[PDB]
Structure 1
Amino acid sequence: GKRVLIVDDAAFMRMMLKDIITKAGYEVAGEATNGREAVEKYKELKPDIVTMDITMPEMNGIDAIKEIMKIDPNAKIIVCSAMGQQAMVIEAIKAGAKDFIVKPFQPSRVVEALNKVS
């Protein structure tokens, strides 16, 4: 109930997040750079939580949310967005995501999101 799958194309953002996740005592089940991989790794790892980057809509992360819900209507998915993406956040929340964080990350906020959702 502590395994997280991180989805984000930015290697460095991924790492940062891992640092945070890990220090807060959670565990990194795995990493993905895009929606398809995520789905595939989600099926393979059955992670506890999923962190999903939605900054670039052309990546269709929202569609991945949905794909995963089909697969597990119990999935707990947090979404990373950037400032001013409130509309996407709402669509993601609309599609099943439980919460959202904003870049640039505030360790405390991410820990809180994680915890709330766990």
Structure 2
Amino acid sequence: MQRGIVWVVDDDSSIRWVLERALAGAGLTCTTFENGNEVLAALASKTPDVLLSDIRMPGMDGLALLKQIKQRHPMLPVIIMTAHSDLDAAVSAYQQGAFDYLPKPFDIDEAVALVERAISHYQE
């Protein structure tokens, strides 16, 4: 097992409480970060089974996070809420290990939905 470690990157607090408790009900560890760069730093000492990134503008709209993820982590599955402009970095993400991208829907329902299916498909 995996113990099931889910890491999320978004505004924290609000996004943390919603995804933490809900994901906690699933039986996994849900931790959140400031935006994307944070997980990168924390990842230097740990690797979650599933990673969720908010995409809103960090450095490269949001896909920038993926780039850093592949540099430090090898194939850490990432889940982005939106793919706005620069889908290019999104594709490379899947190569490095990204789970996928969310078109329009999101919220916890679709987010947690896409996050759980990620850990499940991995298992194994």
TM-score of the superposition, structure 1-length normalised? 0.74
Q: Is the 8 A contact 2:50 2:115 kept in 1?
A: no
In the other structure, the counterpart of 2:11 is 9
* 1:100 CA drift (Å): 3.5
Superposed, which structure 2 residues align to 1:29-40 within 5 Å? 30-40=31-41
Q: Is the 8 A contact 2:12 2:33 kept in 1?
A: no
Q: Is the 8 A contact 2:49 2:119 kept in 1?
A: no
Higher relative contact order, chain-length normalized (CA < 8 Å, sep 6+): 1
Select 1:95's aligned residue among 73, 76, 93: 93
Query: Secondary structure of the equivalent of 2:45?
Result: helix
Higher strand share: 1
My pick for the range that moved more, 2-11 or 106-115, is 106-115
Q: Is the 8 A contact 2:50 2:77 kept in 1?
A: yes
- For 1:70 and 1:100, the matched residues in 2 are separated by 19
Aligned length: 113
Identity of aligned residues (%): 23
Q: CA RMSD in A?
A: 2.5
Q: Is the 8 A contact 2:78 2:99 kept in 1?
A: yes
* 1:52 CA drift (Å): 0.8
* 1:16 CA drift (Å): 0.8
Note if 1:115 corresponds to 2:113.
no
Q: Is the 8 A contact 1:99 1:113 kept in 2?
A: no
Letter in 1 for 2:120: N
Query: Secondary structure of the equivalent of 1:25?
Result: coil
TM-score of the superposition, structure 2-length normalised? 0.71
Note if 1:57 corresponds to 2:62.
no
